């Protein structure tokens, strides 16, 4: 009666890298977050206080995820966006850890763990995509 598994669990990701390639190409924190559903510490991420115009992509596979124009300061300690470039890029699953309910967000293309989505976001969506800095790469606007 709930949603579970990324495309890695289902062994049907469109993009698959070997763990060996990812160990070299990602920092230990980026690897832990995206590959082991880790969470960076509050305010650990470069992109938390970062307001330059551009596009944030999945740090693993490069799929575009978030526009700078939806980024906002949630005071939470992690990057926060009120919308996604398009929802087909995200796998939403139910997270029941710690005796609470949250919706985890993962990349639908490679399965990377990104973060969570909450209902305390600003207008116009009311959504907060709460995303690890270490799950993202940033491409500055032209
Ligand atoms: Zn990805």
Author numbering: -3 to 138
What's in the article?
MsrB1 has an active-site selenocysteine and is found in the nucleus and cytosol. Both MsrB2 and MsrB3 contain active-site cysteines, but MsrB2 is present in mitochondria, and MsrB3, the focus of this article, has distinct splice variants targeted to mitochondria (MsrB3B isoform) or the endoplasmic reticulum (ER) (MsrB3A isoform, hereafter referred to as MsrB3). As anticipated, the MsrB3 structure has the characteristic Mss4-like fold found for other MsrB proteins, consisting of two highly twisted, short-stranded β sheets. The cysteines Cys3 and Cys9, in the CX5C motif, were found to be disulfide bonded to one another adjacent to the zinc-coordinating site and far (∼21 Å) from the active-site cysteine, Cys126.
Human MsrB3, lacking the signal peptide and carboxy-terminal KAEL sequence, was produced in Escherichia coli as a fusion with maltose binding protein (MBP). After cleavage and purification, MsrB3 was treated with dimethylamine-borane complex to methylate lysines as described, since attempts to crystallize the unmethylated protein were unsuccessful. In addition, electron density corresponding to a sulfenic acid was seen for the active-site cysteine in this crystal form, with the hydroxyl group oriented toward a conserved pocket rich with hydrogen bond donors and acceptors. In particular, the side chain hydroxyls of Ser72 and Ser76 as well as a guanidinium nitrogen of Arg124 are all within about 3 Å of the hydroxyl of the sulfenic acid. Though no substrate was added during the preparation of MsrB3 for crystallization, the sulfenic acid modification may have occurred as a byproduct of formaldehyde addition during the methylation reaction.
